[PDB]
Design an enzyme around this catalytic site. Structure first.
Site, short mmCIF file in Angstrom:
data_model
loop_
_atom_site.label_atom_id
_atom_site.label_comp_id
_atom_site.label_asym_id
_atom_site.label_seq_id
_atom_site.Cartn_x
_atom_site.Cartn_y
_atom_site.Cartn_z
N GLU A 92 -5.89 -13.93 -19.64
CA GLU A 92 -4.94 -13.24 -18.91
C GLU A 92 -5.27 -12.31 -17.83
OE1 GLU A 92 -1.48 -13.00 -21.20
OE2 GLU A 92 -1.00 -10.94 -20.59
N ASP A 94 -3.16 -9.86 -15.16
CA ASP A 94 -1.74 -9.36 -15.07
C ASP A 94 -1.53 -8.36 -14.10
OD1 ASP A 94 -0.94 -10.06 -17.61
OD2 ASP A 94 -2.43 -8.63 -18.43
N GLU A 96 1.70 -5.66 -13.73
CA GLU A 96 2.76 -5.14 -14.60
C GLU A 96 3.20 -4.01 -13.91
OE1 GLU A 96 0.46 -5.06 -18.34
OE2 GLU A 96 1.67 -6.83 -18.89
N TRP A 188 4.69 0.18 -26.37
CA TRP A 188 3.82 1.20 -25.77
C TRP A 188 4.30 2.41 -25.19
CZ3 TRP A 188 4.75 -4.19 -25.97
CH2 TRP A 188 3.43 -5.25 -25.77
#
Length: 266
Positions: A92, A94, A96, A188
Site C-alpha cells: 500500500e 497512501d 490520508e 488512532w
C-alpha cells in the site's frame, strides 16, 4: 511555497469517475454528478471506490476537497493497495487526510507498506505534513507517482516526498489498484475520536488523472512524465525541501522510538 517549475497535472487530461473507477463499498453514501464524486461517512457506514484496473506503474491523481469543521477521527484517503489480492500481506502507498477539531489544521499523512502492516509491531513509514492552504475551502490536486525506482507524492504539483527504491524488501513491486475512502479512524485518535454528532463527513473528488500502465498494457507503456527529463529537477527538489523544512510534522525516520531494523531504508 516556490514554483517547482514543472506542473505534471497540467499535462494529463482529466477523466470522469466512471471512466476509471467504480463504487467498492457504501454505494448509498456515494453520488456522481457529471463525473465528480461525492462520498460520505455517518454512523451507519462510510464509503469507498476502487479503480477498474490493476496497475504496474503510473501517475494517479485527483482534485480533492475536504469536509469543514469538526472532523476529529475521520480519514479521507486516496491510495494504491493490493490488500484484496494478498489480504494481510499486502503493499500500500497512501495519502490520508487526518481529521481535526476546528481551530487546528488538517495533517496530510503519506505512508508506504510492503508485504504487510505489522501483526506484533506497528510498522509505518509515515511522513506527515501540515498544508500551506485550507484544504476544505477548495479543490486541490493530490497525486501519487509510482514506478519500479521511486514513489513521489505531489500536492498542487509540488513534490512533498520521494520514497526511492533501496531494496526489494522495502519497496512495492507488485501490482496495485487505486482506492479512495472516508472512514472512522478513532483507534488512532488515542484532538480526539469520531464524534457522529457532526455526521455526514463528506469527501469530494473530481478531475481524476491517470498517466499509467495497467498490468496488461503493451510493454512500451511507461508512466507519465513528472519532471523535465525523468528524474526530479533541482527546482522540484528545492520545492520539496522547502515543504519538508516548513511543514513536516512527523518523519518515521527521525522518530527515536520505532524499530529501524524493521524499516532498514532509513
Amino acid at each position: 511555497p516556490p514554483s517547482p517549475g514543472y506542473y505534471p497535472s497540467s499535462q494529463i487530461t482529466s477523466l470522469g469517475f466512471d471512466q476509471g473507477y467504480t463504487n467498492l463499498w457504501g454505494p448509498q453514501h456515494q453520488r456522481v454528478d457529471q463525473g465528480s464524486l461525492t462520498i460520505w461517512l455517518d454512523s451507519t457506514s462510510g464509503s469507498g471506490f476502487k479503480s477498474i484496473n490493476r496497475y504496474r506503474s503510473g501517475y494517479f491523481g485527483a482534485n480533492i476537497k475536504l469536509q469543514s469543521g469538526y472532523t476529529a477521527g475521520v480519514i479521507t484517503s486516496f491510495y494504491l493497495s493490493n490488500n484484496q489480492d494478498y489480504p494481510g500481506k499486502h503493499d500500500e502507498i497512501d495519502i490520508e487526510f487526518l481529521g481535526t477539531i476546528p481551530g487546528k489544521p488538517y495533517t496530510l499523512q503519506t505512508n508506504v507498506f510492503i508485504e504487510g502492516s505489522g501483526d506484533y509491531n506497528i510498522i509505518g513509514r509515515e511522513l506527515r505534513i501540515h498544508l500551506w492552504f485550507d484544504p476544505t475551502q477548495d479543490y486541490h490536486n493530490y497525486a501519487i507517482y509510482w514506478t519500479p525506482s521511486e514513489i513521489i507524492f505531489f500536492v498542487d504539483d509540488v513534490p512533498i516526498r520521494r520514497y526511492p527504491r533501496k531494496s526489494d524488501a522495502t519497496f512495492p513491486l507488485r501490482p496495485m489498484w487505486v482506492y479512495g475512502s472516508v472512514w472512522d479512524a478513532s483507534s488512532w485518535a488515542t484532538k480526539y475520536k469520531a464524534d457522529y454528532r457532526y455526521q455526514p463527513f463528506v469527501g469530494k473528488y473530481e478531475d481524476f488523472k491517470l498517466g499509467s500502465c495497467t498490468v496488461e498494457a503493451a510493454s512500451s507503456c511507461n508512466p507519465a512524465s513528472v519532471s523535465p527529463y525523468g528524474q526530479l529537477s533541482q527546482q522540484q527538489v528545492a520545492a520539496m525541501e522547502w515543504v519538508q523544512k516548513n511543514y513536516m510534522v512527523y518523519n518515521y525516520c527521525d522518530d527515536p522510538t520505532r524499530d529501524h531494523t524493521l524499516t532498514p531504508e532509513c
